[PDB]
Amino acid sequence: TVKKIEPGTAADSQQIHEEKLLYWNMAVRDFSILINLIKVFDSHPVLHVCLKYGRLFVEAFLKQCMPLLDFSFRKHREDVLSLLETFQLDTRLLHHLCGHSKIHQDTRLTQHVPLLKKTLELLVCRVKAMLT
């Protein structure tokens, strides 16, 4: 479902802008609570399918969300700052999940860590870019 949402235009109207950004908001809040259910659960298939699909989730966040961050920035400043503080808490949580992958030394979990790490560096440097 997160593959489906496309970035519109800067010349797109305010209503479509606000509805798709609140759609992104409930998407990232569902991602955050889906990360929060992992801290009590075990059985490396679980954390492995997490490290699989959360990666392409943040790839969807790269390819579909940040053009909307580029288009609607000047007017919806409070909305995009709420979205970035919503994403920063799951950024630190994904840092914790990759650290949890390193401290257990599993061959299945250690495949999908460094791609997610370099996409974390890409998203934080793009946060620095949209801060400008």
Add this chain to the structure above:
DNA sequence: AAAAAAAAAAAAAAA
């Protein structure tokens, strides 16, 4: 203690 499911690696085929 055995069976099933899932993932990863290797092979093969197509552009």
Add this chain to the structure above:
DNA sequence: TTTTTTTTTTTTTTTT
């Protein structure tokens, strides 16, 4: 002639 993607197999881990 070379690279990528899909399919199949094998192993490992979890459950009954």
